[PDB]
Amino acid sequence: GAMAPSYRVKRMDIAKNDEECVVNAANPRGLPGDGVCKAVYKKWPESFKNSATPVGTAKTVMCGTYPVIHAVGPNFSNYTESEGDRELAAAYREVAKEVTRLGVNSVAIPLLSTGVYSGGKDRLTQSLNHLFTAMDSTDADVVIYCRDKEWEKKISEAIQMRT
Numbered sequence: 296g297a298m299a300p301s302y303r304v305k306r307m308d309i310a311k312n313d314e315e316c317v318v319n320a321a322n323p324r325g326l327p328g329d330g331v332c333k334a335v336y337k338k339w340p341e342s343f344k345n346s347a348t349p350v351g352t353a354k355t356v357m358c359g360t361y362p363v364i365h366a367v368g369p370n371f372s373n374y375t376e377s378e379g380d381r382e383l384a385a386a387y388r389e390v391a392k393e394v395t396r397l398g399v400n401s402v403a404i405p406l407l408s409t410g411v412y413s414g415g416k417d418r419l420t421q422s423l424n425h426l427f428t429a430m431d432s433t434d435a436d437v438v439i440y441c442r443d444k445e446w447e448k449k450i451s452e453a454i455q456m457r458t
């Protein structure tokens with residue numbers, strides 16, 4: 296575990312993270328995809344061997360000794376708000392199990408279902424609260440990666456509010 300487990304947020308490419316493992320915002324078919332998924336494919340392509348996994352689950356594949364945790368959030372274009380919410384919470388609970396099993400002291404994590412799987416809605420608060428619900432009982436240092444300057448502010452405020 297980390298000596299004083301923390302949450303932090305950085306506005307940069309998750310492919311350049313300084314953590315002991317990475318969470319991919321994966322698709323269910325283990326395809327290169329778009330956005331975070333395509334950055335992860337370019338950096339750790341070996342990690343996409345047998346990475347396909349259902350919605351609401353996480354599957355870890357090693358790139359050398361570096362773990363890539365493929366976490367499949369729901370596409371809110373296809374799911375109802377209710378079922379999508381259930382699967383998004385489930386994907387993060389599976390991430391917490393994997394982080395724990397791996398014994399890492401730190402993990403880089405994107406906000407699942409906030410990009411092309413958002414169904415054109417702002418899901419910052421919904422996705423971040425499910426992240427907190429899952430990761431709060433873990434002792435890894437969590438570093439959240441985002442792209443948008445206003446999202447960085449909001450995520451930073453949400454972290455600092457609970458401290």
Ligand SMILES: CNC(=O)c1cn(C)c2ccccc12
Pocket residue numbers: 306307308309330331334405440441442443
């Ligand atoms: C979540 N972060 C990303 O997907 C990013 C990808 N690139 C190329 C970036 C450049 C500046 C800041 C963030 C990103």
Ligand SMILES: [Cl-]
Pocket residue numbers: 306307308311
């Ligand atoms: Cl960057």
Ligand SMILES: [Cl-]
Pocket residue numbers: 320407408409410411412413
């Ligand atoms: Cl997404």
Ligand SMILES: [Cl-]
Pocket residue numbers: 441442443446
């Ligand atoms: Cl963002």
